[PDB]
Symmetry: D2
């Protein structure tokens, strides 16, 4: 007596499938997993609950997991990130998915709850992005923990929570930190946001980037990619940071590094990338230039004080979905994107498929590792082996017509490494 | 007679919201309203406009009307109209004949609706690409003597005006707006640097990083497109016929080679030439699987779209203005906007700030032709550099730029007028 | 009369090695030799040259002589001569009067040595900055009627020629070489993009990354300097008087503000304006400790070096052309080349490849004036675009650029001559 | 009866000192070490043999070590890298230094040998760059190993050798890997080469970079900085790589990635950054464009087959010191810089002082750590703690007028980190 799926409109499935066909040909890593593992079904018996943005790219991941033998039930990890045509294609394929663009907060929790119970038992595997599923099970369903073989977690904020849980003795299931595979953190977080930040801002506002001042809070992998994107289109980018290493990197790249208390007086565009609370406050809003555009690309909507705008503005004018223009008591306006939620996924389409193929090949490898080799993974937070990380990159070279050099026997001897790798030590930072 | 024809008048309130936002990004146009709304220099003008019916053009239209003009409008491309912008103009009582996704015959019909006003025929033309200009000269020559001037937006259109003049077939004075410095060095360059990628992303969502992109032409548009693609991590190859532009591209770190070679390597193809026959069947047959092919020159003449329609073995519509073809060789081609301007056809065109430069020039040109026609004999003219500088100066405050003023000692040293113009006529910026 | 005067003739063999290398980077000049060494179009010319006596200028000189000219040379800056290049020219029998580190009076003496040849006075001028031009007009007017033409290298020099003409004091025809497209859009831009940093590094070895650099002026030189500094991770602030150039800089992501504000923030200061009074005592007093201050405009008029010499409390010579001043406020200023052109004074000037563009134009100008004087009445002229294009085309093979040729169908469509010129006279590239 | 120092010309000392005065004001990290530690003399009793490029920056490091109480004896780690005015200033200060520009190979070994014996005993500390000193002691003087408290090693190739020594049981002294402090690897290797590669090429050749094709072998930290530099001046950069991760990074940045076997036919400039043997061979030279410029910026001269040029060219024309133009049997010419030795230090002045202040503040901290806290460092290869790494960056922010943000109490609580750091986990890659 439970719903089999819930999506905005299953009639979008044919359009979704056309988008999936295109994405497949951009995602050689996931397609290679299908080629290598579709016959052997390494994920047979797995019942994976997934809580991850229900986009075209995630649909290609889902269909990969099913091809490898898993049963899957899916929800989005953000109320605005679902792409309804992609959700439709997954629903039409008979895969239980509970996701649509523009969920309420109650609906959001309800969708995760729909993914826990399969025909043959509760979930026995977690694929998570931000830890909402991880936390739901630990807090509300501790009785299911013993039946879960593993967690794989996508994002910086999510893995931060796993490490914290482990340090406080709260984590009861082995986890693989997918965010910090080299082929995820150094590619998705960086090159993904270099494209999808501007895409979100443009689809929402059509604003010219050239000539503006843009303030980016944080200069981690996300902030590095965001700053590069904005600079490339001729914005003058000002960085805020708490970490003196990241701040020196920003300075050495030619950006002004100062505080939000100063930068709020100058910015025309504000982008938060910190994963931290209380980045853009009332005291900042009141000093901004007229029609300042304010958005967040950190995982949770905790960075911008949107409550302050709702409570203090004279009026909120909705321009279109996920775009609101607040009129302040000082007579100036603030353009807020996606209610302070992830702007790339909320206002556009998130990262393009090619780079998501790197992140999602890591996800598939992690599910296989945890499902088929559980002895290797005691309760704790683990990384994929470098040889697998390198395999993810290698799987994407062909599409780009990259010609990789092979070490000669003599060179391999000289370097003291194997011809087939791994080629770097464990601490290597790329 | 219809008061207008648009897709959906119900889009007017959303259109108006977009216009409100755009006004705040278009200080040059708003300054024209501030300066001239009371004196109404365009009183008596009946301007027929043929120019992409976007949010930005709506702000231009309402500026012309604030200055006293009567206006009737059409788009200059069948896919470029933004229906909410057209609806806002219609709702405001201005005759606009435009919608996204016109047939070719509807396109001509819409231009024809702009010719006749209550008081008489058009007496001014505002054109982007020369279609209105050419229509009048070829089909309505009886109206020519009643037209005081033409202002022309785009490189292809001014190219046509010069050709008409050299052949003695131009019959009305024109101002070349494209070649104001504040148009050609801004709109064509920085405009495309943002809107090309916007069109490609909304259509395909393709990653740019890691791709080879081939840009045909390295003029102002090609310079902007190339820079955009390179900034996102594409490896950009350029084609060119002009050895100066080719040397510029090589000096910027781009490989310059022929389309005959580059067709074997590109994952993305962008035509910027203004020229016929740039991407042909012999090129398509050599392209990497799922190569994305698009045009950003004014007319759809650069890519042989007829060839794909005739020779592909499969053709699948992915979504509006996105088609995926399967060739006899088994590989796929993705074609955007049927080879029409991709930025306006698949996205929203250039952002409003840079369009404020172009459209401030347009307002100035219309005022010059309407109020000082004797300064402009039949021929093709530029705006004075003093006005060109004034366009740029009007956009500095929004960006909080602080311009330096020469001292009288410095102005004497330079032999320069202290308020400009600051550069000689041949200066290239 | 001396056959020459140089620092050290013993440097000739090393000079020759540097010339051999430079020739292989200068295909335009070598092509002029290939084409014209036999026909000798400059037979009869007695060219007095006043232009930085560098390796690149040596290749130019030997090209003029291969074409049949007699030549006598001086540098146009007291610090720009490359003594090995001067020695190679001297050793080859060409009268050159130049060395690095001339006094002001030696500088004038050297120019004066170039005026008289065995057969009579100079009959052609090749100038960079107008000093030879001005010397003849002001001090030797009796020689004017014997001079067939002037070709002038640099923006400041052509500025002077236009001023002379407008005032009716220009008495010899001139060709403006600076404003060939293949000069101004290449040498001024890409040349400075490499040689500014070269001068700053050889003088100071300072890290650029992490600094604030202030560039005064955003013309061709300022565009090149700014790009260079930004590429190494400096945060670049721009000053400008021209609202068009200012808007260009803002659209490229640079803060544009006044020197009055920017003096408080810069760690590096580069003047590119061609104008007097850019960096003054009131600016020095506000600068960060050990701010590096340099000029890349033609004349040393931009920085108030007199102020530092008079008001500093300590002045230490660090090495040739590098001085470190201590002000009354306790902070230090590092001044390069006594405010003279830093790229040529502290390094080697622009690299040979881009100078081949400039100097191919120079050879063409000299041939035009010498062999077709009646085409050039007293006044200031440009080379034809066809020749400008030919300069760029002559450099494409070295870079393995493959230029596309229009088809006859495409040329008909465009109304363009199939071999060029490909752009209208007003084109800005 | 041993020489007290040996330098090209001690008369250069006054000029050297002027350069040192300038460098000090660019090196706030080293100056802060002097301010903090000059009175307490933490390095009293230390007798440090240093084998590291005898440049102006190294002179500031040497004077820092002496201010902190150490006795020091110094040699260069490259035959072309010494800056004679800097060596003169150190000699004049009474510090035994044995280094000059243009040493022969016999002289080079002799100089290291001069640094082993102090008035009060043999060396008891090693400061090394490339491991030549480390290897000399282990191979030729094993009897001195027990009296050495620690090794600090500067460069990637040197630390590679330490790890290899440790894995083979050959390492007998505790070492700190300074190369892989974040504030070294991510700054010196990257931003240092972004400036000093081009400086070396230009001082040697004055070649135009714009319009050329440049081939960079390797896309590690050095190759990343080299590629960026060349691209910035308008060269078209082609990358070679053996590591599929680094190669994907290059591709995602817009570079063509192919093999040297292909790229040799196209390049006008070749830069080797690999740390590996046999990168540019005879078969490559014979296919290059005329006047191709060939140089190496990896630590040892093992990357370019210079022997092949000496044996096969028709003639070698010396242009000036460290610049040779070989005429090949095919009639084309090759311009070889610094005999295939480090081009930035051999043909110009190496990295600028500011970034070397980061590397050398790490060196001073490592010497203090090994000298004063030996119990923390058993025989093995160790990293500096992240808190010290962060302290190095923080010490350079003031000079750049960077304003770092401080976390609020509430934010620190939210993130689960201390207000004063460290701010990142141990695996963070920046
Ligand atoms: N939207 C997306 O597609 C996308 C992609 C990847 C990651 N993420 C999310 O983005 C956020 C950042 O990820 P990351 O990988 O860049 O993490 P990171 O740890 O690499 O970077 C975050 C940076 O924020 C800085 N910071 C923290 N508090 C700050 C403050 N109060 N003011 C200024 N700076 C502060 C930190 O010093 C750190 O350098 C995370 O929430 C992550 O989950 C989003
Ligand atoms: N879509 C837009 O928003 C937009 C904006 C501005 C201009 N335009 C249009 O874009 C086109 C280009 O404009 P522009 O200002 O760059 O003109 P342009 O004259 O500056 O540049 C076009 C370049 O194409 C090169 N070219 C011509 N034929 C070629 C061929 N067969 N192969 C390779 N190169 C060739 C020319 O040498 C020239 O340098 C025109 O049609 C113009 O009207 C479009
Ligand atoms: N050192 C070299 O190798 C080299 C090379 C080429 C040109 N030059 C010289 O460099 C100078 C600049 O040449 P250009 O081609 O860039 O000329 P330009 O006219 O293109 O640019 C100079 C810029 O300075 C700006 N300017 C003038 N006075 C100013 C002031 N007081 N404050 C701020 N900006 C001001 C102008 O608006 C102009 O845009 C000239 O002296 C020229 O002869 C030197
Ligand atoms: N000259 C300097 O001032 C300077 C500065 C720092 C480091 N170094 C030296 O530079 C070299 C590189 O240092 P790094 O920090 O960049 O090391 P790295 O390990 O980060 O980079 C070297 C790269 O070379 C690639 N590589 C190895 N063999 C190759 C081959 N045969 N062909 C193509 N690529 C190959 C590797 O995959 C690796 O990515 C080392 O020798 C280091 O000691 C020099
Ligand atoms: N198109 C996409 N589909 C699925 N996840 C995405 C997309 N773009 C970004 N993400 C993921 O969103 C996460 C933040 O929740 C990032 O770590 C990133 O990996
Ligand atoms: N958003 C826009 N609205 C109106 N015209 C535009 C827009 N974007 C680009 N164009 C114009 O389209 C012309 C090509 O037809 C260009 O010359 C440019 O000025
Ligand atoms: N290496 C060089 N040799 C000769 N002239 C140069 C060099 N570098 C720059 N210049 C010239 O110096 C002029 C300024 O005096 C510039 O116009 C430029 O053409
Ligand atoms: N100016 C310099 N002085 C001393 N060492 C340097 C300089 N430039 C580069 N290096 C060092 O040379 C090492 C390679 O031997 C690099 O790891 C780098 O830290
Ligand atoms: Na997508
Ligand atoms: Na718009
Ligand atoms: Na030179
Ligand atoms: Na130095």
């Amino acid at each position: 007596d439970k719903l089999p799926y819930k999506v905005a409109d299953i009639g979008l499935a044919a359009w979704g499938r056309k988008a999936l066909d295109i994405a497949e040909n951009e995602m050689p890593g996931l397609m290679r997993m299908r080629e290598m593992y579709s016959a052997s079904k390494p994920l047979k018996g797995a019942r994976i609950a997934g809580c991850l943005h229900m986009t075209v790219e995630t649909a290609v991941l889902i269909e990969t997991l099913v091809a490898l033998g898993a049963e899957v039930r899916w929800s989005s990890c953000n109320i605005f990130s679902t792409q309804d045509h992609a959700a439709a294609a997954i629903a039409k394929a008979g895969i239980p998915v509970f996701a649509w663009k523009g969920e309420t907060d109650e609906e959001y929790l309800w969708c995760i709850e729909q993914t826990l119970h399969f025909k043959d038992g509760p979930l026995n595997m977690i694929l998570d992005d931000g830890g909402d599923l991880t936390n739901l099970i630990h807090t509300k369903y501790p009785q299911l923990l013993s039946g879960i073989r593993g967690i794989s977690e996508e994002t910086t904020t999510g893995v931060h929570n796993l490490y914290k849980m482990m340090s406080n003795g709260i984590l009861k299931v082995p986890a693989i930190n997918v965010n910090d595979s080299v082929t995820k953190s150094k590619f998705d977080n960086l090159y993904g946001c270099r494209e999808s930040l501007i895409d979100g801002i443009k689809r929402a506002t059509d604003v010219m980037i050239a000539g503006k001042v843009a303030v980016v809070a944080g200069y981690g992998d996300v902030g590095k990619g965001c700053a590069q994107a904005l600079r490339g289109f001729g914005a003058r980018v000002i960085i805020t940071e708490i970490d003196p290493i990241n701040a020196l990197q920003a300075a050495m790249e030619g950006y002004e590094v100062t505080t939000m208390d100063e930068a709020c007086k100058e910015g025309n565009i504000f982008v938060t990338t910190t994963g931290c609370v209380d980045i853009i406050l009332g005291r900042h809003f009141e000093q901004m230039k007229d029609d300042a555009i304010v958005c967040n690309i950190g995982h949770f909507d905790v960075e911008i004080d949107v409550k302050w705008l709702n409570e203090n503005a004279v009026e909120k004018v909705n321009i279109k979905p996920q775009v609101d223009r607040y009129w302040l008591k000082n007579g100036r306006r603030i353009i807020l994107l996606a209610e302070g939620r992830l702007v790339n996924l909320g206002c556009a389409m998130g990262h393009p498929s090619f780079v998501m193929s790197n992140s999602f090949t890591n996800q598939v490898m992690a599910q296989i590792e945890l499902w088929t080799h559980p002895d290797k993974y005691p309760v704790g937070v683990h990384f994929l082996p470098k040889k697998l990380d390198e395999a993810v990159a290698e799987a994407h070279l062909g599409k780009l017509n990259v010609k990789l050099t092979k070490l000669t026997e003599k060179q391999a001897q000289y370097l003291g490494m194997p011809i087939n790798g791994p080629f770097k030590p464990d601490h290597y930072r790329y």
